[PDB]
A paper describes a structure:
Acetobacter aceti strain 1023 and other acetic acid bacteria use succinyl-CoA:acetate CoA-transferase (AarC) in a variant citric acid cycle that is required for a robust acetic acid resistance (aar) phenotype. Strong selection for key roles in acetic acid resistance and central metabolism appear to have optimized the structural and functional properties of AarC, making it an excellent representative of the class I CoA-transferase superfamily. Class I acyl-CoA:carboxylate CoA-transferases produce reactive acylglutamyl anhydride intermediates that acylate CoA, forming either an acyl-CoA product and a free enzyme or a protein glutamyl-CoA thioester and a carboxylate product. A closed active site enables AarC to engage, immobilize, and desolvate acyl-CoA substrates and to stabilize covalent adducts of Glu294.
Residue numbers in the entry:
A (entry chain A): 3 to 514
B (entry chain B): 2 to 505
Write the structure that this text describes.
Amino acid sequence: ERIRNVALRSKVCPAETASELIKHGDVVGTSGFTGAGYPKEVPKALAQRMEAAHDRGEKYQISLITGASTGPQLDGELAKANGVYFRSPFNTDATMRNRINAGETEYFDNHLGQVAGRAVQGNYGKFNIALVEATAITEDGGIVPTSSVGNSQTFLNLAEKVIIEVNEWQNPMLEGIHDIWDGNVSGVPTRDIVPIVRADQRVGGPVLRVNPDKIAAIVRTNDRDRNAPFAAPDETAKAIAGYLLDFFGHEVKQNRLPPSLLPLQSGVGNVANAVLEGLKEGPFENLVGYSEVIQDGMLAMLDSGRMRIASASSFSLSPEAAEEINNRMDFFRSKIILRQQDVSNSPGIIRRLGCIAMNGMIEADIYGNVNSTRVMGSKMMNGIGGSGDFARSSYLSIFLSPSTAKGGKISAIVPMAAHVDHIMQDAQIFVTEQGLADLRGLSPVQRAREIISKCAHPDYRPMLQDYFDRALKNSFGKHTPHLLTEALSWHQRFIDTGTMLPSSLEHHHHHH
Amino acid sequence: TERIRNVALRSKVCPAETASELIKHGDVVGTSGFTGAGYPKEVPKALAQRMEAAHDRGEKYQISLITGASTGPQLDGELAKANGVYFRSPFNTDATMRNRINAGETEYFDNHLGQVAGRAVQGNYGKFNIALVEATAITEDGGIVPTSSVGNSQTFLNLAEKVIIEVNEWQNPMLEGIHDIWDGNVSGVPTRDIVPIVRADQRVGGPVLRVNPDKIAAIVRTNDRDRNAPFAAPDETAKAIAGYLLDFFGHEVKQNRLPPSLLPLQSGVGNVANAVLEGLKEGPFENLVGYSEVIQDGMLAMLDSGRMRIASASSFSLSPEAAEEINNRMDFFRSKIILRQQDVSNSPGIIRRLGCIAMNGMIEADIYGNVNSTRVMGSKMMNGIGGSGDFARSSYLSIFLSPSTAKGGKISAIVPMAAHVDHIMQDAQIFVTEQGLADLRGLSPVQRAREIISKCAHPDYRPMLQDYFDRALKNSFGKHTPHLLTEALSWHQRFIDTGTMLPS
């Protein structure tokens, strides 16, 4: 039995009935972070009822605040139903992305570590509903989270009414892996000192806490998380990982990093996977993770002993890795700590531990300002996520990307970024399959010489050099040279023609 | 009274010219100095003269200059005149040095002020050859008493191979006691220490910079003045901005979103900040607390009137009139002011913990509320980002304040797209101009634009901004943050071409 508090068993009801508690206009806070631990059955039932209402000319939309990304059963179903008027802080569902980019869903991608605090401040309004997925409910009414913690404790505190989905698909032995603190991290100032001085340090307990009188419904479910396929490293990712690992090796030999490096933050996807595979094969020992996510390559390193501990707010695992950790949850439970995201993404803690931040990007300009979010400056991809939390607070901020996109028709290094998420001050190292730019100690013009020479693709470097050269001669000021007449012209060229590469039918200064 | 109270260290006293000879071509020099206060004065002058002579003989002679923040004509000015600085960080306001920077003659990088010490220890600027630090006094056990700022001086003393102290008799001996220098690991090798500050008036350290006396290569007796802030009063535009902000604070308190005493306050320097402080001085919020980078004129008034109880900062930025008052009454003001290391005053962990209210200026913001603090037309440096990022991102509330226009109406402070970004949308919640106040909390980018355009933009520019936004909504590549890339930067180019952002 998953509901070990007898009194709360009387609140069990079907998903459809529970969804009726959610009203048009409501602000709904849910569990869910990197496709893990989001509610599934109540959102599906809600979406059906939303569509039915819309067909009869009746409005039915919610504001949806999450930990971070969810999955098809939540963002997907609600976006299909056109049921979300406002969304925050981070989405990866393609249907929801389309609603955002059509202006049908208003969106703001907050720094992930800040969301709980802004919720408590009231920026999203009054929370009507918290809808949270659970592994179990304990004897004294504690709520055991599932494959992520995210913002769930904050949403439970704020919401007028609470709905719990108890998912028997989630492994019972997840109980104990979470660390939930009752301290003031995101409440009213003055906040508490968050006393974390080791990545493996627990400060709290294993359960979310909530007044049982606020629980309006409990729904028994049995459904899987998103679990994206493993993105196998291609040669581009492998080259990027190779330059990065060589760099780490050099930092260690110059005593600027310990042989155990520092606590590591990375993502998911191709490049991160290549980096984790390189770390598994590399000369470094006693590694530590202090990140947003646990991904596949870590289980390997936790099992071998290459990595000693991994701190995160969520799992981001493939189907095969998901089965590996479930068959051995009692081992991995001792190696992993899942934290509230306002703790995993706490700038104070990230700086104190001296994390190495490794993040992706859409593009960077020649001065090393970074766009993480908005294609051509206007079309949302996913969101800033925790990349700003980590980039700004880290001991070392590293951005990694293929040097081109769209089969070479887009350069990831541009004269000016069409949107900025990370300013120059927040980015010290850039890595592409072309090489690694170490920007420490450099002015913007010096940053440009390094980025253009080390990171840019051969197809675009002469164009970049031409822009920079002419900017140096003609720019209003020469501290960060620009030609405002063409700074964004590569982006407009892409919009117009589908490529940033110029045609020989017209003049271009780099052909000559 | 003898300023060098350690008898043994008196034997290290030498001329500024001889001391400057310790500094070699290529050296990385860390100095005191923050908001025109407490920078070294006589050794940089002597160095500059020797640099010029060297250059004339065909000898290379340049240094890297790392400071707390801004300095003055004796340091940034003289060295820039001599073409003696190959790299400068993190914050300059001297006109001669600014001209070197914008000519590409001095390399510059404006780091977040709270991060500079940590990056210095990491080695980003290279090995420190020299620390050149101004002192009020040297204590009997060899402690270095800082002057009108603390800045990064403790870190530079730790790092540098050789140390030069300027003991400046111009500086008030009664400054001794006002500083709080922490022994702990804020900016050193990870894992760092927990910084135990949980109230803005909490002292956690001692009154002196610590340095191994064997590293002290020279002590120079000096007698010269800091820079002062302007006396000039806030005009009608600044007073209007302050009025909107104070009305906003009132409503926040009435809605129980701020305490009646508000929260610890951070304020930049300028006319607008002065207006806000004058507003608060006779405002309805009592028992105020400052947790800022700087102590300015307005704070002294409030610390005097009791309307403000304590002010924490790293430096002074005072007018001649205000400087005279504090120096006449240092007894009193010393008990009301704490001067901290800048990596503590600007610690994002502390700023968030205390829940600071950040109030900063700007060059411009775009319609989505991204902020440019630094680079005119995107390429010409003004001063630098300073501590505005430390505070904007970490604060409980991040507010940006500016006149809606500049250059007699020929520049709009609200533009379609910022030509350079220092603060992203996520780091700016409230904008105030003399036209009104935009509260952006809870809003998507297109919702932010409606508020910024209608509340903050000047009437001369508002229809142009609305026209841009409306056509972007129709024709932009994506509709989440609509832009027309062909004209996004066109107002800036129009200014470059014609001298005004207004069409013919």
